[PDB]
Curated annotation (Swiss-Prot), chain A:
Protein name (database record): WD repeat-containing protein 5
Function comment: Contributes to histone modification. May position the N-terminus of histone H3 for efficient trimethylation at 'Lys-4'. As part of the MLL1/MLL complex it is involved in methylation and dimethylation at 'Lys-4' of histone H3. H3 'Lys-4' methylation represents a specific tag for epigenetic transcriptional activation. As part of the NSL complex it may be involved in acetylation of nucleosomal histone H4 on several lysine residues. May regulate osteoblasts differentiation.
Outcome after substituting residue 293 to A: Strongly reduced affinity for histone H3. No effect on interaction with KMT2A
Gene: WDR5
Species classification: Eukaryota, Metazoa, Chordata, Craniata, Vertebrata
Family: Belongs to the WD repeat WDR5/wds family.
Length: 304, 5
């Protein structure tokens, strides 16, 4: 697997505004999609076949996440709330009020038994699913928090923020373990826990992508070549046909580096506006991509 | 959406 061959297959249109995030179902049969038009749209993760449209938020949504069992979604919207939905209907289960500003990111733990959320009020909050009550609030950073992700077991959350900081928090404790200053305080647009859980993948607004051994505080691989310095663009770990890195870019293309050699390996052209978010289908080697206001569409790409 | 900027 030296080089992949992701060719465009379908083009998915339905969102009346810019698309904020697209995330793949655990079982892989579905593909959720958050937009700036206060809506969510469910699609067939293999054929396109637009199925459901979930509504309820008063303002637009910046992020959605799936539950391990593949039938609940939580949406981080700009009306200071998060909402938990079942996809087996479209009905809003519980609304998680608590935040003071825009809610930016959200994620489910592996056990799907609690929510972790970040917002513009510089605080991360942990929430229980059934009792839509904020289990605890962490004074995360002193700027809006970009991304927030649970590790593979569920005992660690990683948060990043605009104050150039990346924090590792134990969950059922709230105490912060480490923080990655290590440089020139560049705004961290995004961070994700790596698959096997021993690393984090951090994005900073200076057109770089770094993979950290946050344990040692070392950086191990550095992926550049794209444009990223205004929007907090999602990144992915494609681990089905060869081990790569996928991320959007402000030049309207999807950049893919070989995880092991910092090497650009393929760039996918198709979008008219910025590519804000991607996602790699679990089993099948398909990458989805969504763009902003002058594009507002989704694309599936199959290959390996 | 703040993400869509």
């Amino acid at each position: 697997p030296v080089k992949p061959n992701y060719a465009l297959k379908f083009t998915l249109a339905g969102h009346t505004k810019a698309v904020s995030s697209v995330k793949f179902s655990p079982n892989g049969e579905w593909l959720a999609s958050s937009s700036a038009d206060k809506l969510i749209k469910i699609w067939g993760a293999y054929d396109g076949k637009f199925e459901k449209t979930i509504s309820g938020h008063k303002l637009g949504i910046s992020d959605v996440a799936w539950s391990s069992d593949s039938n609940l979604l939580v949406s981080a919207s700009d009306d200071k709330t998060l909402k938990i939905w079942d996809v087996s209907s479209g009905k809003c289960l519980k609304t998680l009020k608590g935040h003071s500003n825009y809610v930016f990111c959200c994620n489910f733990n592996p056990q799907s038994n609690l929510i972790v959320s970040g917002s513009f009020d510089e605080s991360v909050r942990i929430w229980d699913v059934k009792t839509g009550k904020c289990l605890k609030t962490l004074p995360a950073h002193s700027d809006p928090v970009s991304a927030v992700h649970f590790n593979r077991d569920g005992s660690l959350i990683v948060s990043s923020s605009y104050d150039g900081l990346c924090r590792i928090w134990d969950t059922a404790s709230g105490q912060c373990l480490k923080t990655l200053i290590d440089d020139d305080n560049p705004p961290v647009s995004f961070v994700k826990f790596s698959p096997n859980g021993k690393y984090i993948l951090a994005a900073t607004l200076d057109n770089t992508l770094k993979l950290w051994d946050y344990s040692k505080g070392k950086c191990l691989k550095t992926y550049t070549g794209h444009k990223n310095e205004k929007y907090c663009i999602f990144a992915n770990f494609s681990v089905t046909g060869g081990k790569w890195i996928v991320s959007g870019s402000e030049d309207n293309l999807v950049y893919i580096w070989n995880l092991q050699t910092k090497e650009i390996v393929q760039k996918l052209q198709g979008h008219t506006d910025v590519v804000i978010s991607t996602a790699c289908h679990p089993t099948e080697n398909i990458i989805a991509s969504a763009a902003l206001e002058n594009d507002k569409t989704i694309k599936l790409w199959k290959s390996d | 959406x703040x993400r869509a900027x």
